[PDB]
């Protein structure tokens, strides 16, 4: 018993998406269907309920659909805040009956501005140094579109030794985030002149450094 | 109408996890509700798990055959609170789990799900719970905190006690090939505030019982 | 009609988690001295002080003709309204593809029949292969509980006798 | 909208009801969602109201329409009334009555 949706699904700012949903007759087929939208790990909002009453404070371009055994979700005027994944439910009366989400269907809206990635990177405290131990941060947000990669330095060499780098993820503004670290240890770190945090971004290079 | 959810955030293989989900706020309201658990692994599909009826009494759990035997749902209507419980606990159950309302308000159609906890993450493992150690990463300005070596999921930060808000980015954990967890908090801040204004971060972990503070 | 198979067609504990379905019995109704209703339509009232609105519908897969019975339901007094369905100004309606028509509670004051001041019109439709039949409402809907799917035969008919078989 | 039936014959008329599937289609149409039509003759005097509802998919429609007709008779006034939902008559017939005439059903070739 599951409800089939697309992976994903994309449009432009202006126009509309529909994602479909496809059940069988014990649940679309004989009940109401309600729509979720939801930011990728938060808690999910609900947007169509009673096959598109929309719940107060829902815009009215989102609107929904049943026919026969399967449903659609119509978002039209596309928009920036809409880019979420967004599921379909519905009852179902096999069995003693029970609730049914889709897979979920992945939308994102193109055509957004390219960004530059900020770049931050902090050098170890005395305490850290104190505990016998360093770690260097590198924290990089507000990128766009979502790959780049790291590049930790000693003054001249490349350094692998020691590197920690996250996948890049979403935030709320649809910009991206991620944090690579390079742990040493306390001779490393006083030893050299500088290290450096290096990002590429679209064939682009930014990079900070400091000294002890 | 407030909903929290709330249980432990680290359970052994084969235990039985116990979620409560509370209450709170008033209703003078003609309406009935009944509520869900619905739980989602990391990157997956919400999958929904079981409800109980607030004026009836009357259940459903998940046809899912694999754990249809496994759940429990019960309501204590004088404390407000529902619970789940889920015996013979497997990693592949590590997930977020929410507790959810379906409002029914007379003549519309059902408040279907209505109203969502904010969800509790529940880790399976073996592993043994460690808290972070807290580091100042010291300086518009920007200064912040570095958490590190914690485990499991997830952490809290705090400005001055939340009230600094403004300019705040705290970044999403990295897993170390040892196990663990670490992240960093930052704020972007007026440039000549500076040994102006006091900033304290506060750390909560609260898989170990560890509330630190720390100046930068 | 020679033969007909009869199934379940909304069943009772997994069809209406919404709508309270275990109050709709009459002493008009009795069994065994207490009170019941009939076997093959089931009574939906307000489960706790909320009857929303409900909608369902069944399609006919079954590659026969399907007879579909139902009820709307016309109490006495508007407290008898708030009490079994909560909503004072509600409806039902029913859609075929072919038969097609809104219903609309009236509350009056009728002699008592069976004890009862309340009346029930029952009504039927045959859904036909493929057909979808729809039902929705804010309160007075006798659900269908067991439906009959029909096998044609002819020249059979009802006759009226007191002779033994 | 009246129209009086100065042929010296009956006239035959059709028109239509319209019944939408959702309150927001009745909003986008006739802009009030408690509408309704009312239709009458000398004869003929039915007062109809939309009944918004959700039906199968006909013809890849979940609305609905129902035809109406009626024999205005020489003389008579038929008046239209709507607040929404009404398919107006734009052509009507004027009848002349044979007999012995009929309908029927065949594949044979003129
Ligand atoms: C199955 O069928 C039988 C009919 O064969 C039916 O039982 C019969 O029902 C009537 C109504 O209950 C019974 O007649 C009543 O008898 C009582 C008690 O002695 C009288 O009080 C009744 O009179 C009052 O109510 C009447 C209106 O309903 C008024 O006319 C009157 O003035 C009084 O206020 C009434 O006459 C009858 O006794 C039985 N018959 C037999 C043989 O038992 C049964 O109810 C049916 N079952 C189902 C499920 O339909
Ligand atoms: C004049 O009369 C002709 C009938 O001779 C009519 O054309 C016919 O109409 C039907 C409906 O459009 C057509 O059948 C359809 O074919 C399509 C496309 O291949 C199918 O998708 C349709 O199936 C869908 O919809 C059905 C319900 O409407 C469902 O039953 C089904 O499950 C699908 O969802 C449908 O079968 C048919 O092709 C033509 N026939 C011919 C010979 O062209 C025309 O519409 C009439 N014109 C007017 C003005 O009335």
Redesign the pocket.
């Known amino acids: 018993p599951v409800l089939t949706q697309p992976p994903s699904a994309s449009g432009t700012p202006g126009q509309r998406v529909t994602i479909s949903c496809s059940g069988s007759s014990s649940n679309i087929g004989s009940n109401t269907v309600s729509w979720y939208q939801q930011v990728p790990g938060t808690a999910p909002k609900l947007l169509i309920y009673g096959n598109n009453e929309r719940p107060s404070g829902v815009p009215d371009r989102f609107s929904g659909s049943k026919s026969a055994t399967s449903a659609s979700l119509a978002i039209s005027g596309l928009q920036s805040e809409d880019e979420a994944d967004y599921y379909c439910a519905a009852w179902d009366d096999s069995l003693n009956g029970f609730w049914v989400f889709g897979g979920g269907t992945k939308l994102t809206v193109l055509g957004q501005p390219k960004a530059a990635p900020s770049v931050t990177l902090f050098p170890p405290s005395s305490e850290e140094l104190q505990a016998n131990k360093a770690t260097l941060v590198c924290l990089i947000s507000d990128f766009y579109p979502g790959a780049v990669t790291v590049a930790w330095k000693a003054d001249s060499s490349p350094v692998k030794a020691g590197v920690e780098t996250t996948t890049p993820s979403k935030q709320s503004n649809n910009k991206y985030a991620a944090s690579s670290y390079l742990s040493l240890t306390p001779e490393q770190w006083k030893s050299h002149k500088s290290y450096s945090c290096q990002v590429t971004h679209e064939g682009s290079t930014v990079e900070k450094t400091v000294a002890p | 109408v407030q909903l929290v959810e709330s249980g432990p955030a680290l359970v052994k293989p084969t235990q039985t996890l116990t979620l409560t989900c509370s209450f709170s706020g008033f209703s003078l309201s003609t309406s009935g509700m009944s509520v869900s658990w619905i739980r989602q692994p990391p990157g997956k599909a919400l999958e929904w798990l079981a409800l109980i009826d607030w004026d009836d009494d009357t259940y459903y759990i998940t046809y899912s055959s694999s754990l249809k035997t496994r759940l429990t749902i019960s309501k204590d209507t004088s404390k407000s609170q529902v619970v789940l419980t889920m015996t013979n606990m497997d990693p592949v159950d590590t997930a977020t789990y929410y507790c959810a309302r379906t409002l029914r308000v007379s003549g519309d159609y059902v408040r279907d799900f209505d109203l969502w906890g904010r969800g509790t993450l529940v880790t399976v493992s073996s592993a043994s719970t460690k808290g972070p150690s807290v580091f100042p990463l010291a300086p518009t300005a920007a200064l912040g905190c570095l958490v590190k070596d914690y485990f499991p999921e997830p952490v809290t930060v705090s400005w001055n006690s939340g009230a600094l808000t403004s300019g705040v980015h705290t970044f999403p954990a990295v897993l170390q090939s040892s196990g663990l967890y670490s992240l960093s908090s930052v704020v972007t801040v007026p440039s000549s505030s500076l040994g102006t204004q006091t900033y304290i971060c506060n750390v909560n972990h609260k898989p170990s019982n560890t509330k630190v503070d720390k100046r930068v | 009609v020679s033969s007909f198979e009869k199934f379940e067609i909304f069943p009772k504990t997994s069809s209406w988690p919404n709508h309270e379905t275990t109050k709709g019995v009459t002493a ?4 065994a001295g207490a009170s ?1 209703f009939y076997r093959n339509l089931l009574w939906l009232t307000k489960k706790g002080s909320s009857y929303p609105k409900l909608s369902k519908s069944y399609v006919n897969n079954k590659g026969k003709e399907v007879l579909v019975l139902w009820g709307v339901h016309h109490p006495p007094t508007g407290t008898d309204q708030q009490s079994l369905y909560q909503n004072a100004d509600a409806y039902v309606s029913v859609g075929s593809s072919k038969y097609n028509r809104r219903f609309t509670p009236e509350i009056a004051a009728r002699p ?4 009862q001041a309340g009346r029930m019109n029952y009504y039927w439709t045959l859904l036909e292969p493929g057909d979808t039949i729809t039902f929705e409402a804010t309160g007075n809907l006798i659900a269908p509980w067991y439906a009959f799917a029909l096998n044609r035969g002819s020249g059979s008919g009802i006759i009226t006798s007191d002779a033994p078989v």
């Open positions: 008009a109704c009795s069994y019941s008592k029949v069976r004890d």
